Design a protein around this ligand. Structure first.
Ligand SMILES: [Sr+2]
Ligand SMILES: [Sr+2]
Lengths: 188, 158, 298, 122, 105, 298, 53
């Protein structure tokens, strides 16, 4: 089986407050909590990015809608954040619980797509580079879910943004899909 | 573990209460520490040259009660003596002993919980070459958290 | 020695006709299953087993019902009298009795058969099936416990004795152990040791117009549920029954029975399920309780 | 006004637990007075004839909470019978709900009632 | 509680290496509970969601005395702060020489 | 010689009541199936067969449960005792013992029967069905291995011996081989040779406030999982159980048991399944381990 | 490694026709791993995703 860390909703109305006293002295944003329960995931279908289908899993503990599920793997992923710099990143599959049935089978939605929900973006923002759109989309002050900054490969998002149809107001989902298709990348 | 005391024992063995257990109880009731005392002179102590005889004086030091019945304390010539109550629990026959010292040597040793000898000043005796000149008693400190009172009278200050 | 089965019309009630099915004219023989079935919800991923929650299912009980009449008239009269007595009451209580135990089941009549294959003097061999409401529950008598004052002993207790003006000595182990309490007769514990579901408590109130009923305390001295009634006059006794199937609340005065449900405190009565702790009497001079707690397999 | 476009950055408005709508930037609390979950929405506005930004109260209406009312459908209690159009206060699993008996279902087996909470609790 | 003495309803008892389990991310109200019918163990400790002190007269009547003495605040992992309950001295008339007040009169 | 079946209420626990179902009063006979079933997911394209992943499914074991009492009272007393002991614990451990092996199963009560067909002195012959949680796992004591210094030999070892000022010769094959290491008592390997699923370790910690607990190394000397706790005071022993059904992470100090779940490092504890490599003790003076490892068919 | 000598922690060893399998489209960090408890084979090589010295 796979190990799961169940946390309550990463409410940005709570965690987006710089009142945490750091050991040096200065104030930083509230850190993520400890899992309310450590459980194990059985009878699962887990998607890495959630480009086409939504994930599903039957969890041992009785999770509820809103809770964040962190699926753990005993392996490490090396991500190149700077030209030469690489960092030891532990393998994770982070989802938001959308619905739980009678048999405790939880419908899991990939954290990113559940974060950029209901967010609309005008044509004015699509005029600049792809970096400007990513910097707009990922913001814990606007988002439904908490985020402590993105990690991005400059070379792939260096290019000029794709031209919008009718130069209208598009949703964060439609623009991300349009951008991720041209750049040939998906978020994790 | 919870050690119960103010409770009856049906088989007469369940809840026995010792000297240290009651000693801690008395300290909490009056609001005193190991640095202060509860002292009352039923009859004024007599002064005979470089000696002080306590006719009838009751003292509660570290929650332990004892009476001084015509107990004479030797004094130092032309000096400000400090009368201390010394409690050594190892001395099963005579735990309480008195001493007139040069300075206030109140140690505040926790005798009811841990080991050691408790020293605490209760009376200051100022003497000359011949006899006692003046006597001043040590203030009885009553440490409390909150007080709900009707009327009060203060002789010193707040 | 041998096993005794008994069918009861209104167990815990006054109008309880009892049918001795082991001994009497109508007999219950060869029970189908007295055991139990359980569905544990065990799902296994990669050989390792994870266990869910076990739903402890109870199977129907089917008895070989034989009649022992003297004539065809007598056997027909038994089948008609027995089966209709089971139908008159919404549910019929069975009693499983042996040398070691005495338990009860609240069966509901599922199926009874009547055929024309008569043995000698029109006797019957038929199968009677029952559906289970509650399978195995004890019907124990619950009573309060009294607290007694420890004996006074010289040197061991707290007294100022011997030579005047009295003396009590501090000793290692012996010291002073308090005897008891002035008016210890004021302490009474109605102890609850195991979880109960239903109970038939008769409660006699003291003062009229003062809330009368029983309250329940947990292990930490906090109240969870309380059956509290308010009355205008003193009802000789309040006859409360917590059984779900035939829940009964009634304040008896003389020969008149009054329904006390609308006059009961709805906020205080949070649950029927009694937890481990104690029970306190509110405005009650006397009480007689009959406790009925579960047993899955016996 | 100068670009006739939405060139300027957005202003985020949060509705507190009491109901007061404030700018998210203006917030100085600990999160206890804010909702346990954040359901967001993006709104577009056109500047008035005077040129002034849209009023706070007008935004408030588009971000207001709806009347959450509990409906309890239950079997008829013969100890205390309840009928259609009766003003009632129901105690259910330790919680008090206040409203009225809206309907009654007559079936061959049971008799049931629908309880509708009228709300207006605080 | 390594070595804490308590007087509740005039009854003295000692907490010697007595551990009380707490609720996470909560304000725990620590109570001393006295039940005289529990002859062998009359005193027990509890960690509760509210101050549930009941003022039950255990020296004159029946019932369980519950009295809160400590307030322990937790995070998801451990204790963040502890605040004791005030010890009230109710007196009629006081004769005193000197007094020191740290709070207010 | 012959096969031994034993039922354990709580294997790996102090409160372990053992029922001898081979020798004792309550006996298990004729197991339904001790084998296994597998679903291989074989899909075929144009006559050629492609095989997926094999889900090894374990089937229910049904035993012919017999009682050996001396009276009707004793046989009823066995059925009540044996079945309730199985119900008291959420899951029961079977012990399949033979001349060659000693395997264990984690069973859950599926169905038990009680009938009135009594043999002699109220004898019982009933069928007991069990649901499989984990089928066949070895329960063994895991201990560390010690390394000892090799003996010193003249001409073979690196020493300057014989005629002064010492001489060591480079030969072909025999040459110089180091004897051992100074303080070779520091080297201790806790060896993991086969993949293990759950374990019951009693950890003895050294320093307080320093993360104390075991970590697991793979074959290349890297860490995959670690059960590490950071306590405020020195626990006399940390008890850790990796069993899925009843996980225990308690720090004992004296007679007091403390829950260590919130103090644990959630990020380091990546998996429960231990792989081939070695175990390292972080801030530990002594360690005592019991390793359980699964076997599909035995 | 056809004929490579290495000294790691003052321990000398030789890699004689020793092949290390690599991850594709990646930067492979080749490590020498010394475990003295593995009496018969104390040294082993690994290709890793990061420098894990
Ligand atoms: Sr009845
Ligand atoms: Sr166990």
């Amino acid at each position: 089986m796979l190990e799961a860390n169940v946390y309550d909703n990463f409410n940005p109305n709570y965690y987006n407050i710089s009142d945490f006293s750091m050991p040096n002295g200065k104030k930083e944003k509230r850190g993520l909590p400890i899992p309310k329960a450590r459980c194990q995931v059985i009878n699962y279908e887990l998607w890495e990015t959630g480009y086409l289908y939504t994930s599903s899993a039957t969890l041992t503990v009785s999770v509820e809608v809103g809770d964040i599920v962190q699926i753990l793997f005993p392996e490490v992923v090396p991500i190149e954040e700077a030209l030469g710099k690489k960092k030891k990143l532990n393998l994770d599959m982070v989802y938001l619980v959308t619905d739980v049935d009678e048999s405790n089978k939880a419908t899991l939605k990939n954290y990113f797509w559940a974060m950029i929900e209901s967010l609309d973006v005008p044509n004015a923002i699509t005029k600049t580079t792809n970096f400007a759109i990513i910097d707009y989309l990922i913001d814990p002050n606007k988002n439904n879910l908490m985020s402590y900054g993105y990690f991005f490969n400059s070379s792939i998002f260096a290019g000029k943004a794709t031209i919008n149809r009718k130069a209208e107001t598009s949703s964060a989902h439609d623009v991300a899909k349009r951008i991720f298709s041209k750049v040939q990348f998906q978020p994790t | 573990t919870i050690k119960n005391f103010t409770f009856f024992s049906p088989n007469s063995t369940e809840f026995p209460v010792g000297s240290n257990n009651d000693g801690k109880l008395y300290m909490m009731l009056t609001g005193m520490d190991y640095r202060t005392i509860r002292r009352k002179d039923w009859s004024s102590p007599l002064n005979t040259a470089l000696n002080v005889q306590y006719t009838n004086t009751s003292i509660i030091a570290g929650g332990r009660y004892f009476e001084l019945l015509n107990e004479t304390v030797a004094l130092k010539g032309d000096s400000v003596n400090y009368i201390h109550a010394n409690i050594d629990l190892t001395q099963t026959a005579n735990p309480v002993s008195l001493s007139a010292e040069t300075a206030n040597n109140s140690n505040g040793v926790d005798i009811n919980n841990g080991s050691g000898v408790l020293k605490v000043c209760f009376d200051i005796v100022t003497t000359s070459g011949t006899g006692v000149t003046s006597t001043k008693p040590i203030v009885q400190t009553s440490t409390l958290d909150s007080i709900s009172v009707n009327d009060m009278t203060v002789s010193g200050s707040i | 020695g041998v096993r005794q089965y008994k069918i009861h019309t209104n167990l815990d009630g006054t109008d309880d006709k009892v049918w001795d099915v082991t001994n009497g004219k109508v007999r219950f023989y060869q029970p189908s299953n007295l055991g139990l079935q359980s569905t544990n919800n065990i799902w296994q991923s990669n050989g390792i087993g994870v266990m869910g929650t076990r739903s402890i299912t109870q199977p129907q009980i089917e008895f070989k019902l034989e009649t022992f009449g003297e004539s065809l008239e007598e056997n027909y009269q038994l089948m008609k009298d027995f089966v209709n007595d089971i139908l008159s009451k919404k549910f019929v209580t069975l009693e499983y009795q042996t040398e070691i135990f005495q338990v009860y089941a609240d069966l509901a009549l599922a199926d009874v058969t009547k055929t024309e294959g008569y043995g000698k003097n029109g006797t019957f061999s038929e199968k009677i099936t029952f559906d289970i409401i509650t399978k195995w529950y004890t019907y124990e008598n619950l009573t309060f416990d009294k607290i007694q004052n420890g004996k006074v002993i010289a040197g061991m207790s707290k007294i100022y004795g011997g030579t005047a003006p009295g003396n009590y000595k501090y000793i290692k182990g012996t010291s002073y152990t308090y005897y008891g309490e002035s008016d210890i007769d004021r302490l009474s514990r109605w102890d609850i040791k195991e979880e109960i579901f239903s109970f038939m408590g008769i409660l006699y109130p003291k003062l009229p117009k003062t809330p009368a009923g029983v309250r329940f305390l947990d292990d930490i001295g906090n109240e969870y549920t309380a059956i509290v009634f308010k009355t205008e006059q003193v009802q000789d006794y309040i006859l409360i029954n917590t059984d779900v199937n035939d829940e009964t609340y009634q304040g008896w005065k003389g020969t008149t029975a009054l329904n006390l449900f609308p006059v009961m405190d709805f906020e205080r009565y949070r649950t029927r399920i009694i937890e481990k702790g104690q029970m306190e009497l509110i405005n009650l001079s006397k009480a007689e309780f009959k406790i009925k707690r579960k047993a899955d397999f016996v | 006004k100068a670009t006739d476009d939405y060139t300027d950055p957005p202003k985020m408005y949060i509705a507190k637990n009491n109901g007061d709508v404030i700018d998210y930037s203006t917030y100085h609390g600990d999160g206890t007075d804010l909702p346990d979950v954040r359901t967001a929405k993006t709104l577009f506005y056109d500047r008035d004839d005077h040129g002034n930004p849209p009023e706070l109260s007008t935004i408030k209406v588009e971000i207001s909470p709806s009347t959450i009312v509990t409906r309890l459908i239950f079997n008829q209690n013969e100890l205390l019978p309840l009928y259609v159009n009766d003003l009632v206060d129901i105690w259910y699993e330790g919680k008090l709900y206040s409203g009225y008996i809206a309907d009654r279902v007559k079936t061959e087996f049971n008799d049931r009632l629908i309880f509708v909470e009228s709300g207006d609790k605080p």
